[PDB]
């Protein structure tokens, strides 16, 4: 559920 609004947007399935 960890999503970072960046480029590229890094999202961990947590």
From Swiss-Prot:
Disulfide bonds join 3-11. There is a cross-link at residues 1-14 (Cyclopeptide (Gly-Asp)). It comes from the Eukaryota. This is a cyclic peptide. The record marks 5-6 as: Reactive bond. Inhibits trypsin, cathepsin G, elastase, chymotrypsin and thrombin. Does not inhibit factor Xa. This is Trypsin inhibitor 1. The lineage of its organism: Eukaryota, Viridiplantae, Streptophyta, Embryophyta, Tracheophyta. The gene is sfti1. The chain holds residues 40 to 53 of 56 of the full protein.
